[PDB]
Amino acid sequence: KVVIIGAGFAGLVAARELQTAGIEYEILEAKDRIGGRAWTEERMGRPLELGATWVHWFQAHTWTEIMRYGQRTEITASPSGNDAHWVTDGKVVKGTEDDLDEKLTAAMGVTYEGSEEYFPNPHDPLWVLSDDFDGPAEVRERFLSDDQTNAIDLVKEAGFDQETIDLVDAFWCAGYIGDPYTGSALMAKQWGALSDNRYRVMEDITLKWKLNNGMRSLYDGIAGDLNTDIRLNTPVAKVEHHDNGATVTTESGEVIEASAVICTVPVGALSNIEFSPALPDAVQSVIDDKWNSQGAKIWIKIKGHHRFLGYAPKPAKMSVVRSEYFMDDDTTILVGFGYDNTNIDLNSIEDAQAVINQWRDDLEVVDTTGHNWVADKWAGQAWGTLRKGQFTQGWSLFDQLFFAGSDYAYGWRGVCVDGALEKGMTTARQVINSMR
Numbered sequence: 001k002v003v004i005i006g007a008g009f010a011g012l013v014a015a016r017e018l019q020t021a022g023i024e025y026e027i028l029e030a031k032d033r034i035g036g037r038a039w040t041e042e043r044m045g046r047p048l049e050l051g052a053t054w055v056h057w058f059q060a061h062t063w064t065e066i067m068r069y070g071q072r073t074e075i076t077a078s079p080s081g082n083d084a085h086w087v088t089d090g091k092v093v094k095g096t097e098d099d100l101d102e103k104l105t106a107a108m109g110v111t112y113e114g115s116e117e118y119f120p121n122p123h124d125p126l127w128v129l130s131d132d133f134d135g136p137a138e139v140r141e142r143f144l145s146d147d148q149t150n151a152i153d154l155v156k157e158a159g160f161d162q163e164t165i166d167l168v169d170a171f172w173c174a175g176y177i178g179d180p181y182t183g184s185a186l187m188a189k190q191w192g193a194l195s196d197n198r199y200r201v202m203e204d205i206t207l208k209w210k211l212n213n214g215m216r217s218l219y220d221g222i223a224g225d226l227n228t229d230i231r232l233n234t235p236v237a238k239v240e241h242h243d244n245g246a247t248v249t250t251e252s253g254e255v256i257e258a259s260a261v262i263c264t265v266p267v268g269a270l271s272n273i274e275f276s277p278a279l280p281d282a283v284q285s286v287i288d289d290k291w292n293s294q295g296a297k298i299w300i301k302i303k304g305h306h307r308f309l310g311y312a313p314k315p316a317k318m319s320v321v322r323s324e325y326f327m328d329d330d331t332t333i334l335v336g337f338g339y340d341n342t343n344i345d346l347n348s349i350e351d352a353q354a355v356i357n358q359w360r361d362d363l364e365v366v367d368t369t370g371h372n373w374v375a376d377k378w379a380g381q382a383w384g385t386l387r388k389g390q391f392t393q394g395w396s397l398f399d400q401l402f403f404a405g406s407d408y409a410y411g412w413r414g415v416c417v418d419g420a421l422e423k424g425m426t427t428a429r430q431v432i433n434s435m436r
């Protein structure tokens, strides 16, 4: 009777939560697989994370699921190396990773400025805008100003040199999964607050520990708890939402009546659904503007064992590339993040070779793979990231129709499964509370 649209983490956890409360539900998934933008798949001779992959015990919702489904000890840290390669001014620079992390640490210290006054409770991101905010009016003028500034301009204005500017350019090409210059600096500042305002903790939480058994160990766990079969290959085309319940029409014309709808379809894919009545103009504006998730994630296999770390600013095909697995077949698997999905074919060896050639001439690519989420009709975006203005006038606007998903979370929004687990569960609680 409650229809959940989408069988990603948010819809799976919402279903389990409704099941706990004894509330009847049905999950409709457009694809022939569950997991959504988390997708552990058999590629290049390894289970590979085609979507998300890193976790941490400081992510409350993700960690509780890790504990629930037996993965407590099944995490492995990504490998480290001694040297990094970077491109500052149309030239490749090689230096120690220690020297790299010092420059990045100093830049993040400037990027985080204000986060202690903005986010004393980092799960209350809009507290500065609240009615009883008790800080100075200056802190109220800097918060709104930061929503309209990108994270690179904060570093340029502090007088950092071009090398550091190019390093943070590359960093946020990966972090903002697209063009960082159109992004909102407050995203970066909230990441810092959730990470005790320390760059090393931020990296520990988002880019260190991998699930040995993949995200699949978690989303199959949740689905394995459900007492109602997920309806795969059942795309939703129309949602009618009134005061008395709602109606959902599938792509095939099947009409489902429902007391409520929990819609986990990401912003990049909401255009496939006709909403009757139409969504509010403020929400439609965000849907038109889309995310800042125009990038891509690649997996590259090269000959030999090489501990590699490369940074390249926009418009590089890939901005951050790092070794992740050393195969017993004398090869290394690297992961890369790039700002523009249309400038790279994730499955073309020549394009992957062009990526490695950004920094080196002695490394040979033998395979490459990736799923282009932006060109995936049911996603339309990688992980959700914020354009200018979307920290205070974006994700919070989505409020018997409820939107749930990582892109609307209070905490680790968009970038982490933690946000999907948070918002799926709390949205189910909204439905539970209304029926009680």
Ligand SMILES: Cc1cc2nc3c(=O)[nH]c(=O)nc-3n(C[C@H](O)[C@H](O)[C@H](O)COP(=O)(O)OP(=O)(O)OC[C@H]3O[C@@H](n4cnc5c(N)ncnc54)[C@H](O)[C@@H]3O)c2cc1C
Pocket: 005, 006, 007, 008, 009, 010, 011, 028, 029, 030, 031, 034, 035, 036, 037, 038, 050, 051, 052, 053, 054, 055, 206, 234, 235, 236, 237, 264, 265, 266, 269, 272, 273, 296, 297, 373, 377, 378, 379, 381, 382, 383, 404, 405, 406, 407, 414, 415, 416, 417, 418, 419, 420
């Ligand atoms: C490349 C990439 C790497 C990532 N790496 C990490 C990482 O290392 N760590 C981490 O914690 N997080 C990571 N994430 C983030 C994580 O994948 C997401 O935050 C989380 O999976 C989002 O879940 P969701 O349920 O909110 O949305 P989704 O997973 O997008 O679920 C929505 C579901 O709705 C379905 N759907 C869409 N339209 C319709 C329709 N019309 N009818 C029916 N069903 C429909 C979709 O097929 C999908 O199954 C990554 C994301 C990406 C894209």
Ligand SMILES: NCCc1c[nH]c2ccccc12
Pocket: 051, 052, 053, 054, 171, 174, 175, 206, 207, 297, 320, 337, 415
């Ligand atoms: N696949 C993990 C995506 C990610 C989360 N945080 C990041 C920071 C920089 C680059 C990628 C990421």
